[PDB]
Protein backbone atom coordinates (compact mmCIF):
# COMPACT_ATOMS: atom_id res chain seq x y z
CA UNK A 1 0.00 0.00 0.00
CA UNK A 2 1.32 3.70 -1.23
CA UNK A 3 2.52 5.78 1.85
CA UNK A 4 3.65 8.57 -0.31
CA UNK A 5 3.68 9.97 -4.03
CA UNK A 6 6.17 11.88 -6.04
CA UNK A 7 3.80 13.48 -8.68
CA UNK A 8 5.87 14.42 -11.75
CA UNK A 9 3.89 17.74 -13.10
CA UNK A 10 2.81 17.72 -16.49
CA UNK A 11 5.27 19.39 -19.16
CA UNK A 12 6.37 18.88 -22.61
CA UNK A 13 7.04 15.26 -22.15
CA UNK A 14 3.43 14.94 -21.06
CA UNK A 15 0.43 14.46 -18.97
CA UNK A 16 1.11 14.60 -15.51
CA UNK A 17 2.09 11.15 -13.64
CA UNK A 18 1.90 10.17 -9.97
CA UNK A 19 4.06 7.94 -8.62
CA UNK A 20 3.18 5.66 -5.37
CA UNK A 21 6.13 5.61 -3.01
CA UNK A 22 6.48 2.19 -0.07
CA UNK A 23 8.10 1.75 2.97
CA UNK A 24 12.00 0.71 2.19
CA UNK A 25 14.07 1.95 -0.66
CA UNK A 26 12.13 3.95 -3.63
CA UNK A 27 14.74 4.29 -6.43
CA UNK A 28 14.12 7.17 -8.66
CA UNK A 29 15.95 6.15 -12.15
CA UNK A 30 15.40 5.57 -16.18
CA UNK A 31 14.93 1.88 -15.29
CA UNK A 32 11.18 -0.43 -15.28
CA UNK A 33 13.22 -1.80 -11.91
CA UNK A 34 12.29 1.39 -10.37
CA UNK A 35 9.52 2.57 -7.66
CA UNK A 36 9.93 5.72 -9.85
CA UNK A 37 10.61 4.89 -13.44
CA UNK A 38 11.17 7.74 -15.06
CA UNK A 39 11.57 7.38 -19.58
CA UNK A 40 13.62 10.47 -20.09
CA UNK A 41 16.92 10.37 -21.41
CA UNK A 42 18.09 13.27 -19.03
CA UNK A 43 16.95 10.97 -16.15
CA UNK A 44 20.03 8.52 -14.75
CA UNK A 45 19.09 5.03 -14.47
CA UNK A 46 19.87 4.91 -11.11
CA UNK A 47 19.09 8.61 -10.35
CA UNK A 48 18.33 9.19 -6.74
CA UNK A 49 16.38 7.13 -3.60
CA UNK A 50 13.29 8.11 -1.71
CA UNK A 51 14.05 6.45 1.97
CA UNK A 52 10.80 5.52 3.88
CA UNK A 53 11.65 4.04 7.32
CA UNK A 54 8.51 4.77 8.42
CA UNK A 55 5.51 5.90 7.46
CA UNK A 56 5.12 8.38 10.28
CA UNK A 57 8.92 9.89 9.74
CA UNK A 58 10.57 12.42 6.55
CA UNK A 59 11.40 10.26 3.57
CA UNK A 60 14.78 11.19 3.32
CA UNK A 61 16.17 11.77 -0.52
CA UNK A 62 19.33 11.40 -1.90
CA UNK A 63 20.98 11.90 -5.46
CA UNK A 64 23.35 8.61 -6.37
CA UNK A 65 25.63 10.55 -8.32
CA UNK A 66 23.42 11.53 -11.62
CA UNK A 67 24.62 12.70 -14.71
CA UNK A 68 22.34 15.50 -14.69
CA UNK A 69 21.88 16.03 -10.62
CA UNK A 70 18.77 16.48 -8.08
CA UNK A 71 17.66 19.73 -6.75
CA UNK A 72 15.76 20.74 -4.09
CA UNK A 73 13.78 23.80 -4.95
CA UNK A 74 13.22 26.06 -1.68
CA UNK A 75 15.92 27.00 -1.02
CA UNK A 76 16.79 26.01 -4.41
CA UNK A 77 20.39 24.16 -3.95
CA UNK A 78 21.45 21.64 -6.36
CA UNK A 79 21.66 18.19 -3.74
CA UNK A 80 25.28 17.28 -3.58
CA UNK A 81 25.06 13.18 -4.52
CA UNK A 82 25.27 10.90 -0.98
CA UNK A 83 23.79 14.23 0.79
CA UNK A 84 20.63 13.05 2.79
CA UNK A 85 17.57 15.57 2.40
CA UNK A 86 14.68 15.29 4.57
CA UNK A 87 11.57 15.45 2.41
CA UNK A 88 8.79 17.61 3.62
CA UNK A 89 5.05 16.67 2.66
CA UNK A 90 4.38 19.39 -0.43
CA UNK A 91 7.73 19.83 -1.39
CA UNK A 92 9.18 20.15 -4.72
CA UNK A 93 12.28 18.59 -5.71
CA UNK A 94 13.75 18.82 -9.72
CA UNK A 95 15.43 15.34 -11.02
CA UNK A 96 17.76 16.60 -13.72
CA UNK A 97 14.79 19.41 -15.58
CA UNK A 98 11.56 17.58 -14.18
CA UNK A 99 9.92 18.72 -10.77
CA UNK A 100 8.26 16.57 -8.98
CA UNK A 101 6.58 17.31 -5.19
CA UNK A 102 6.18 14.61 -2.75
CA UNK A 103 2.85 14.21 -0.55
CA UNK A 104 2.37 11.88 2.36
CA UNK A 105 -0.62 9.96 1.56
CA UNK A 106 -3.07 7.76 3.89
CA UNK A 107 -4.13 4.40 3.00
CA UNK B 1 -6.77 37.61 -27.12
CA UNK B 2 -6.31 34.20 -25.95
CA UNK B 3 -3.36 33.10 -23.34
CA UNK B 4 0.31 32.71 -25.07
CA UNK B 5 1.88 30.97 -21.52
CA UNK B 6 0.74 30.47 -17.89
CA UNK B 7 2.29 30.16 -14.54
CA UNK B 8 1.56 27.37 -12.36
CA UNK B 9 1.42 28.17 -8.55
CA UNK B 10 2.09 24.52 -6.93
CA UNK B 11 0.39 23.66 -3.59
CA UNK B 12 1.75 24.30 -0.68
CA UNK B 13 0.63 25.19 3.29
CA UNK B 14 -0.63 28.54 1.73
CA UNK B 15 -3.17 26.82 -0.18
CA UNK B 16 -3.92 24.57 -2.95
CA UNK B 17 -2.18 24.03 -6.73
CA UNK B 18 -3.83 26.79 -9.23
CA UNK B 19 -3.25 28.48 -12.69
CA UNK B 20 -2.60 31.68 -14.09
CA UNK B 21 -2.73 32.36 -17.93
CA UNK B 22 -0.35 34.98 -19.07
CA UNK B 23 -0.91 36.95 -22.15
CA UNK B 24 1.00 39.26 -24.52
CA UNK B 25 1.97 42.69 -23.00
CA UNK B 26 2.84 43.28 -19.55
CA UNK B 27 1.81 40.27 -16.73
CA UNK B 28 2.50 41.95 -13.28
CA UNK B 29 2.80 39.19 -10.45
CA UNK B 30 1.86 40.90 -6.90
CA UNK B 31 -0.08 41.12 -3.90
CA UNK B 32 -2.23 43.79 -5.58
CA UNK B 33 -5.74 42.43 -6.66
CA UNK B 34 -5.51 44.17 -9.74
CA UNK B 35 -2.44 42.86 -10.90
CA UNK B 36 -2.46 39.75 -13.47
CA UNK B 37 -1.10 37.40 -11.68
CA UNK B 38 -2.36 38.43 -8.51
CA UNK B 39 -0.90 36.04 -5.61
CA UNK B 40 -3.24 36.78 -2.58
CA UNK B 41 -0.05 36.15 0.28
CA UNK B 42 1.41 38.62 2.66
CA UNK B 43 5.50 38.14 1.76
CA UNK B 44 4.51 39.05 -2.16
CA UNK B 45 5.21 43.14 -2.75
CA UNK B 46 1.72 44.92 -4.02
CA UNK B 47 4.03 45.15 -7.56
CA UNK B 48 6.42 42.36 -7.11
CA UNK B 49 7.40 41.18 -10.37
CA UNK B 50 6.17 41.72 -14.50
CA UNK B 51 6.43 38.97 -17.25
CA UNK B 52 6.59 40.98 -19.91
CA UNK B 53 5.67 39.12 -23.48
CA UNK B 54 6.02 40.73 -27.35
CA UNK B 55 5.23 38.00 -29.45
CA UNK B 56 3.31 34.07 -29.20
CA UNK B 57 6.98 32.59 -30.41
CA UNK B 58 9.53 34.72 -28.24
CA UNK B 59 10.44 33.83 -24.64
CA UNK B 60 8.72 36.31 -21.94
CA UNK B 61 11.31 38.45 -20.26
CA UNK B 62 10.93 38.14 -16.04
CA UNK B 63 12.37 41.11 -13.82
CA UNK B 64 11.60 41.93 -10.41
CA UNK B 65 9.99 45.60 -9.26
CA UNK B 66 12.54 46.02 -6.32
CA UNK B 67 10.09 43.18 -4.43
CA UNK B 68 10.39 43.24 -0.57
CA UNK B 69 11.41 39.61 -0.22
CA UNK B 70 13.06 39.06 -3.99
CA UNK B 71 12.39 37.17 -7.09
CA UNK B 72 14.60 33.93 -7.73
CA UNK B 73 15.43 32.01 -11.10
CA UNK B 74 15.13 28.16 -9.10
CA UNK B 75 18.09 26.66 -11.81
CA UNK B 76 20.92 27.06 -11.96
CA UNK B 77 19.73 29.11 -8.49
CA UNK B 78 20.22 33.27 -8.73
CA UNK B 79 18.21 35.95 -7.01
CA UNK B 80 17.47 38.43 -9.75
CA UNK B 81 17.79 41.99 -8.38
CA UNK B 82 15.42 44.38 -9.12
CA UNK B 83 16.36 45.70 -12.96
CA UNK B 84 17.62 42.74 -14.47
CA UNK B 85 15.86 41.13 -17.34
CA UNK B 86 15.55 37.44 -16.93
CA UNK B 87 14.68 35.24 -20.20
CA UNK B 88 12.32 33.15 -19.11
CA UNK B 89 12.46 28.99 -20.50
CA UNK B 90 9.59 27.34 -21.04
CA UNK B 91 9.32 24.86 -17.85
CA UNK B 92 11.25 26.43 -15.32
CA UNK B 93 10.53 27.51 -11.60
CA UNK B 94 10.28 30.89 -10.59
CA UNK B 95 9.99 31.46 -6.59
CA UNK B 96 8.30 34.84 -5.96
CA UNK B 97 9.52 34.91 -2.20
CA UNK B 98 8.75 31.70 -0.77
CA UNK B 99 6.90 30.62 -3.63
CA UNK B 100 7.87 28.31 -5.98
CA UNK B 101 6.07 28.87 -9.94
CA UNK B 102 6.20 27.00 -13.39
CA UNK B 103 6.30 28.86 -16.47
CA UNK B 104 4.45 27.09 -19.43
CA UNK B 105 4.48 28.69 -23.02
CA UNK B 106 0.69 27.44 -24.41
CA UNK B 107 0.19 25.74 -28.05
Redesign the interface.
Known amino acids: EPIGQLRL?S??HGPERDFPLYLGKNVVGRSPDCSVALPFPSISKQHAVIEISAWNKAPILQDCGSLNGT?I??????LPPGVSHRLRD?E?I?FA?F?C?YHRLDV
Do not use: A, I, M, S
Not at 73 to 78: A, E, G, L, W
Open positions: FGTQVKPPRVQLLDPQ
